[PDB]
Structure formats: C-alpha cells, structure tokens
Design an enzyme around this catalytic site. Sequence first.
Site, short mmCIF file in Angstrom:
data_model
loop_
_atom_site.label_atom_id
_atom_site.label_comp_id
_atom_site.label_asym_id
_atom_site.label_seq_id
_atom_site.Cartn_x
_atom_site.Cartn_y
_atom_site.Cartn_z
N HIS A 61 0.86 -1.22 0.00
CA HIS A 61 0.00 0.00 0.00
C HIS A 61 0.88 1.25 0.00
O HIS A 61 0.48 2.27 -0.58
CB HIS A 61 -0.94 -0.01 1.22
CG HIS A 61 -1.78 -1.24 1.38
ND1 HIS A 61 -2.79 -1.53 0.50
CD2 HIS A 61 -1.80 -2.21 2.33
CE1 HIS A 61 -3.42 -2.63 0.87
NE2 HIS A 61 -2.82 -3.08 1.99
N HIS A 91 5.44 6.90 6.85
CA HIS A 91 5.13 6.52 5.47
C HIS A 91 4.55 7.73 4.76
O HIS A 91 4.32 8.78 5.40
CB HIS A 91 4.12 5.37 5.43
CG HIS A 91 2.83 5.73 6.07
ND1 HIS A 91 2.60 5.62 7.42
CD2 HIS A 91 1.74 6.35 5.57
CE1 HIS A 91 1.40 6.13 7.70
NE2 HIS A 91 0.86 6.59 6.58
N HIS A 93 1.73 9.10 1.42
CA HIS A 93 0.65 8.94 0.44
C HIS A 93 0.96 9.89 -0.71
O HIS A 93 1.43 11.00 -0.45
CB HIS A 93 -0.72 9.27 1.05
CG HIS A 93 -1.03 8.52 2.31
ND1 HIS A 93 -1.84 7.40 2.30
CD2 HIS A 93 -0.64 8.70 3.60
CE1 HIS A 93 -1.91 6.93 3.54
NE2 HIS A 93 -1.17 7.71 4.37
N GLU A 103 -3.81 13.45 1.55
CA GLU A 103 -5.07 12.94 2.17
C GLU A 103 -5.82 14.11 2.76
O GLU A 103 -6.95 14.40 2.33
CB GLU A 103 -4.70 11.88 3.20
CG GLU A 103 -4.10 10.65 2.56
CD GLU A 103 -4.32 9.39 3.35
OE1 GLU A 103 -4.00 9.38 4.56
OE2 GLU A 103 -4.82 8.40 2.74
N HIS A 116 3.26 10.94 6.93
CA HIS A 116 2.64 10.60 8.22
C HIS A 116 3.68 9.98 9.13
O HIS A 116 4.20 8.91 8.81
CB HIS A 116 1.47 9.64 8.02
CG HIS A 116 0.32 10.30 7.38
ND1 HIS A 116 -0.71 9.57 6.78
CD2 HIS A 116 0.01 11.61 7.21
CE1 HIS A 116 -1.57 10.41 6.28
NE2 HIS A 116 -1.20 11.66 6.56
N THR A 195 -6.32 6.34 8.37
CA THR A 195 -6.85 6.62 7.02
C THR A 195 -6.79 5.36 6.15
O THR A 195 -7.19 5.46 4.99
CB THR A 195 -6.16 7.77 6.30
OG1 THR A 195 -4.84 7.34 5.95
CG2 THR A 195 -6.13 9.03 7.12
N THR A 196 -6.29 4.24 6.67
CA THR A 196 -6.38 2.93 6.00
C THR A 196 -7.14 2.02 6.93
O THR A 196 -7.17 2.22 8.15
CB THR A 196 -5.01 2.30 5.75
OG1 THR A 196 -4.39 1.94 6.98
CG2 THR A 196 -4.06 3.19 5.00
N1 LIG Z 1 -2.41 6.63 7.20
S1 LIG Z 1 -2.37 6.25 8.71
O1 LIG Z 1 -3.62 6.56 9.39
O2 LIG Z 1 -1.17 6.76 9.33
C1 LIG Z 1 -2.34 4.47 8.78
C2 LIG Z 1 -1.15 3.95 8.06
C3 LIG Z 1 -1.35 2.44 7.81
C4 LIG Z 1 -1.16 1.58 9.06
B1 LIG Z 1 -2.06 0.09 9.06
B2 LIG Z 1 -2.36 -0.28 10.78
B3 LIG Z 1 -1.02 -1.09 9.89
B4 LIG Z 1 -0.76 -0.50 11.55
B5 LIG Z 1 -1.65 1.04 11.76
B6 LIG Z 1 -2.46 1.40 10.21
B7 LIG Z 1 -0.93 2.22 10.64
B8 LIG Z 1 0.40 1.40 9.74
B9 LIG Z 1 0.51 -0.26 10.31
B10 LIG Z 1 -0.29 0.10 8.77
C5 LIG Z 1 0.05 1.03 11.38
ZN LIG Z 2 -0.91 7.57 6.36
#
Ligand SMILES: [N]S(=O)(=O)[C][C][C]C1234B567B89%10B5%11%12B85%13B98%14B%1061B821B326B%115(B%12724)C%13%1416
Ligand SMILES: [Zn+2]
EC number: 4.2.1.1
Length: 257
Positions: A61, A91, A93, A103, A116, A195-196
């Site tokens: 993703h 990470h 987007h 976003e 983020h 946001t995911t």
């Molecule tokens: N865009 S955001 O709200 O920062 C979420 C980013 C995606 C996720 B999913 B779940 B797993 B875990 B939470 B969520 B955040 B990273 B890992 B992966 C962490």
């Molecule tokens: Zn994010």
Amino acid sequence: HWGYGKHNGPEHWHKDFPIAKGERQSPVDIDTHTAKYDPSLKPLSVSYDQATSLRILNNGHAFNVEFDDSQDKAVLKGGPLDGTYRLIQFHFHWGSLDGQGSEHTVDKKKYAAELHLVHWNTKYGDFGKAVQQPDGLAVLGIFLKVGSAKPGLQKVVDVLDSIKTKGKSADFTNFDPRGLLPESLDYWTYPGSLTTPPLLECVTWIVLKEPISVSSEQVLKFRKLNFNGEGEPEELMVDNWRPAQPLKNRQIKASFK
Ligand SMILES: [N]S(=O)(=O)[C][C][C]C1234B567B89%10B5%11%12B85%13B98%14B%1061B821B326B%115(B%12724)C%13%1416
Ligand SMILES: [Zn+2]
C-alpha cells in the site's frame, strides 16, 4: 483485499470496515477560515535526536520506515497532547501526478504527497493496545509540494529500488527523520482515525501548515514502486490516498494566528 482501485478502493472499505462511515473519520478538508486559533494549544515538542530507524518495508500500500520503539527515544508531546507518544514508523501517500496525492486538503487544495509520522501513547504500553483507545495515537502530517529537492529525503528515495514490490524490506538504519521537517511547527489539530483499514478512531491528528518541498525526481521515484508482489503483473504504486471524509461534529483548531 482492500486497496486503492475501482474494485477495492476507499468507496468499498465500509463493507469490511463499517467504521468507514463513523463519526471521526480521516482525512478531512481543513477550511482555514473556519479553523479557530486556540491560544491554549502548546508548541509541538518533536524530540527525534535519538530516533533509531531499523528497516524500510513495501507493505503493498505504501513504504514504511520503521523505528525501534522499545525505549523512549523519539517522542512527540505538547501541542494538543496529554503525555508522551513514541515514534513507531513513517510513510507517505502520493499521487499519479503532482496535482493530487495528499489525504488532508487545505481549502480543497491537494498537495503532491503527505508524510505521516505515527506515534503511540506510552500510557497504553504497546501499539496494539493504543489503537483501541480514542487517544491512542498521534499522527504528525506534513504536506509535500514539488519544487526544490529535500536533501534529507534522498536516502529514502535511493533505497526504493531495493523494495520495489509488496513484501520486500531492506535494512534502513541511522535515518534521521529531523531532515523531513519544515521550518515552522505551526499546526492544525482535530480528532480522527487511521486513514487505511482498520480505520480505527484512535488518532489525534496534527497537520503542519508549512509544506516541505521535494523535487520532481524524488516524487517520480515514489511512483516507480509497485502495489503488486515480485513476479506479478505490474500495478504502479500511485494514488494511495483516501479522499476527505465528512467533518461531522468536529472542530479543527489552529496553533497560530
Ligand atoms: N495513514 S495512517 O492513518 O497513518 C495508517 C497507516 C497504515 C497503518 B495500518 B495499521 B497497519 B498499523 B496502523 B495502520 B498504521 B500502519 B501499520 B499500517 C500502522
Ligand atoms: Zn498515512
């Protein structure tokens, strides 16, 4: 599985994650005229001097730069926060073109990308317990516009060729996230969600007003990543953003006049 396509993208997520239609979903449009200056908000304290990056991962993703969060090293506090939030990962987007990718939006303006930095509230002991709490996470959001290069981003850009496909990781030690911050820590804040999927309503959002500039060449390297795994048909990793969600019964607060 959920993703960003016609068949599995954001307008489908509510079927597997009904909280998608909840009361505190993210991201949102930041209407700058409606956001109220809150003189009670504190300056953000970003303490990243001792941050220890471990690894970079393509999760299908986005790419995640991960930190050793086993001690209080890299912490966010102050601003709207009560107590201490530990950096676990960052990470981005981003879009298929420079006119989309963020976003959050600002008066409906979309930026080319959004960074983020994800932090969890140490009062809950681990990230998995924190995401079950309304004040479990603090995510620091930073807009990217295309112009001058961001020198502190280039170490991330250069490692992406080694994690092109879903499930690839690479050692990524000694990366200093201070090199991704803008000059000003002026911010907007509101209560929201991941946001995911799983879209949990556990986040205090802190969105910096000042964007960082990255070069066209830097963002073009983000767009060479793949959503697919090695030896699968190529789907470029682009447009991995959720659109703005309804603000509902929320106030966005500004740290600045
Ligand atoms: N865009 S955001 O709200 O920062 C979420 C980013 C995606 C996720 B999913 B779940 B797993 B875990 B939470 B969520 B955040 B990273 B890992 B992966 C962490
Ligand atoms: Zn994010």
